[PDB]
Amino acid sequence: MSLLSKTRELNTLLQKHKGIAVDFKDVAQTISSVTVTNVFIVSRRGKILGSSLNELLKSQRIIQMLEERHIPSEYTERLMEVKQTESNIDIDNVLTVFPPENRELFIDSRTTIFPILGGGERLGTLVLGRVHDDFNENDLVLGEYAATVIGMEILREKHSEVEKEARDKAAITMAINSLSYSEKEAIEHIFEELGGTEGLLIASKVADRVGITRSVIVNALRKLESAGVIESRSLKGTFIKVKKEKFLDELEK
């Protein structure tokens, strides 16, 4: 299989996945496919963001890592001292991705470590392990590109998290300020007489219980929908749901 074919298999995933975000679980599968490796994609603190494992599944310690969704803290710290691609690491080296207590299985194994960088900083690590053959230039071309793309994706996720929490705050503030005082009260009555932050609403039944007009209730919900703090499909009954769960607390302030 040509390097060009291997890169195309990875790029096809990157170009055609659904949603805005690449799923690193998928990336791990594809990297494993084109390099015939055991693959970990881990965060800075060792959370397993994706894995694609074969021979490593034999090891009971590895099985436990998958359950905990974390590599050991010791290995985590070791990876963070690797600041350059280091390849063809053997089983008696502490950077090996194989369990030393299963040395006999992995006597000829090779590990390569690819730091994941973005925004000029270390965002995680991509680790590849083979039971037999050495890694070559093709493997490093694939791995370093993959690590770069994973870094881009983490950087995007991190920025979009920061942006979203800033823009949520503003949207909630705009929403709240667009309600009349009566409407603020109606919303309080609506979510009190709902099982929390969402559920099925019968406006008439709530209006009659708290002694207000359905019109005010309908108006307030319409305002919140257009503001985008709640979703609500209008089928007897109306399901409503708060998107920004910082809303109700802010509303009472």
Q: Where is the binding site for L-isoleucine, in residues?
A: 61, 96, 98
Chosen residue from 37, 75, 102, 153 binding ligand GTP by CB under 6 A: 153
| CA–CA separation, 222 and 123 (whole Å) | 42
Sign of CA dihedral 58, 61, 67, 70: negative
Considering only CA atoms, give the Rg of the chain.
26
Among residues 105 and 218, whose Cβ is nearest to its own copies? 218
Q: Binding-site residues for GTP, please? A: 22, 24, 43-45, 47, 153, 158
The contact mask relative to ligand ILE for 82-121 (x = CB under 6 A, - = no) is --------------xxxxx---------------------
Three-class secondary structure of residue 163 per DSSP: helix
Q: Which is nearer to ligand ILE, 97 or 186 (CB)?
A: 97
CA distance 77 to 7: 30
- Residue 242 Cα distances to 118, 130, 169, 225, angstroms: 34, 48, 14, 9
The Cα–Cα gap between 95 and 114 comes to: 12
Among the listed residues 125, 117, 121, 122, the one whose alpha carbon sits nearest the alpha carbon of residue 97: 125
Q: Which of residues 125-184 bind its own copies (CB under 8 A)?
A: 137, 140-141, 144-145, 147-149, 151-153, 155-156, 159, 166-167, 170-171, 173-174, 177-178
Would you say how long the chain is, in residues? 253
Q: How far apart are the first and last CA of the chain?
A: 63
Name the segment binding ligand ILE (CB under 6 A); options: 71-79, 175-183, 208-216, 236-244. 71-79
When binding is defined by CB under 6 A, the residue of 55, 90, 144, 157 that contacts ligand GTP is 157
Give the footprint of its own copies on this chain (CB under 8 A): 2-4, 7-8, 10-11, 14-18, 20, 22, 117-120, 137, 140-141, 144-145, 147-149, 151-153, 155-156, 159, 166-167, 170-171, 173-174, 177-178, 223, 226-228
Give the footprint of ligand ILE on this chain (CB under 6 A): 71-72, 75, 96-100
